[PDB]
Amino acid sequence: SMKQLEDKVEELLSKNYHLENEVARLKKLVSKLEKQLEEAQKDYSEIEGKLEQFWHDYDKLE
Amino acid sequence: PGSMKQLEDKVEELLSKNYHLENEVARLKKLVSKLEKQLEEAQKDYSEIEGKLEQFWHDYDKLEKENKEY
């Protein structure tokens, strides 16, 4: 029964290990995502400023 | 007995951390898909402005094109 508990802590140890590998994977993916989203936001803001500027310039020729 | 209680303490510890780790896996998965939604929508918005720019240049160069035909 002591052998049983040692078996149990080993079982839990390896399940714990795999969970924490998955948690690290998912956290690295959250960070990659948040960087990508920041990048997409700056991009959108840039191309919106561009479109607005070309139309502003165009309007200026009246 | 005593060493048995020490191992049972290690088991309770692992059991709780595993429950919390599964909760965090679920939570992080939710977070990941929310971030993917937000990214995909930002990409929609970018693509929309890009289409607007392409149509602007099309309309603009259409002036020169038709002026050459006059």
Residue numbers in the entry:
A (entry chain A): 38 to 99
B (entry chain B): 36 to 105
What does the paper say about this structure?
Success was had with a version of M87 protein (amino acids, aa 68–105) that had a portion of the canonical coiled-coil protein GCN4 (aa 250–278) fused in register to its N-terminus. GCN4 fusion was pursued to stabilize coiled-coil formation in the M87 protein fragment, a technique that has proven successful in the crystallization of a number of coiled-coil proteins. GCN4-M87 was likewise in α-helical conformation throughout, but strikingly, only the GCN4 portion formed a coiled coil while the M87 α-helices were unfurled and asymmetrically disposed. This was best appreciated by comparing the structures of the complexed and free form of GCN4-M87. Free GCN4-M87 formed a dimeric coiled coil throughout, indicating that the unfurling of the M87 α-helices was unique to the bound form. The greatest extent of unfurling occurred at Phe91, in which the distance between Cα atoms was 8.7 Å in the free form but 15.6 Å in the bound form. The two α-helices of M87 protein in the free state formed a coiled coil, with amino acids in the core a and d positions engaged in ‘knobs-into-holes’ packing. Intriguingly, analysis of ‘knobs-into-holes’ packing of M87 in the free state shows that A77 and Y81 are not ideally packed. This suggests that the segment containing A77 and Y81 may initiate unfurling to bind LL-37. The loose ‘knobs-into-holes’ packing of Y81 in the free form of M87, along with the conservation of the Tyr in M proteins shown or implicated to bind LL-37, suggests that this may be a general site for initiating unfurling.
